[PDB]
Amino acid sequence: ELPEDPRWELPRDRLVLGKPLGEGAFGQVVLAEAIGLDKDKPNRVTKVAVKMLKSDATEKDLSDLISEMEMMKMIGKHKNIINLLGACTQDGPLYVIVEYASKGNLREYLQARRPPGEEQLSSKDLVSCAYQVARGMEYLASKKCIHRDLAARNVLVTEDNVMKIADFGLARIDYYKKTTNGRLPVKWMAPEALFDRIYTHQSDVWSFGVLLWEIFTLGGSPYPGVPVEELFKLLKEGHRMDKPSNCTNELYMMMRDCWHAVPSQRPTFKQLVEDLDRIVALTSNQE
């Protein structure tokens, strides 16, 4: 049995469950329609994403779902994060109701827009995407949240092309474990986070640098064919990824600054938001 929180509770007859969303990257998530989430009006439907537990769910799987919801309540609202919209906690399974992003993850969204062998993104659209992700991250940081897994796969894209950071309310690692696409999350990890288990806003700044690299290569894979052990060796040697093609030196120096050996010397998300805001303004939409 769960305690009823009336700030968030939505009656069960007000949620129409639909087809599963994606390849279960964020757990068991379905598309749904919520009848009257707002008082004006109780007659409007909103497409929402609903997270619930699987059939083979443990008492720990339920505890994590609750913590994530409670965490989302505490963080508050921001344009550039997946927002909590409601929950079904009484007389049945737990349903955590969050914002729906119809264009999928930033890696997919970017990949579908790569020039041929939907539509192409200009040089400004790419800088705008980065600006939005740094904006989202800055909010979470201001609310004391450390993501730990910032990647393009954890950035969802809405129908209106808004960048929304996902999987920010979770708190946990197997270095050899792969993602859905067959990629290794250790590749986005700061060395101090990787070797010393030291997680900070600074280790998230490292990850943002890899995320910018993902935007500028239009969904490129970091370190292809590089196993865990060889990656360790690259980081220890001070190796850094090469400058993507059709990337300015100003933006490559931002990735580099993000990947500073010394965590204190990296820019903050507050600083990144300022720099990217200025760069968006000066970036051409003509190419």
Task: Give the interface segment with ligand 66T, choosing from 52-60, 86-94, 95-103, 209-217 (CB under 6 A).
Answer: 95-103
Count H helices and E strands in the chain, helices first.
8, 7
**Active-site residue 149, yes or no?**
yes
Inter-CA distances, 208 with 132, 135, 189, Å: 12, 11, 10
Choose between 51 and 187: whose C-beta lies nearer to ligand 66T: 51
- The sign of the dihedral angle between the CA atoms of 223, 226, 227, 232 is negative
Residue closer to ligand 66T by CB (options 27, 36) is: 27
Segment near ligand 66T (CB under 6 A), from 100-108, 187-195, 239-247, 253-261? 100-108
Written in H, E and C, the secondary structure of 114-136 is: CCCCCCCCCHHHHHHHHHHHHHH
State which of residues 10, 32, 34, 49 lies at the interface with ligand 66T (CB under 6 A): 49
Amino acid at the residue 1: E
Q: Is 103 in the site for ligand 66T (CB under 6 A)?
A: yes
Query: According to CB under 6 A, which one of 26, 95, 139, 252 is a site residue for ligand 66T?
Result: 26
Q: How many chain residues interact with ligand 66T (CB under 6 A)?
A: 22
Residue 188 is given by DSSP the state: G
Catalytic residue among 149, 257, 275, 277: 149
What does each C-alpha distance from 22 to 19, 56, 142, 156, 265 come to in angstroms?
A: 9, 19, 30, 11, 38
Residues within the interface to ligand 66T (CB under 6 A):
21-22, 26, 29, 49, 51, 68, 82, 96, 98-104, 108, 156, 166-169
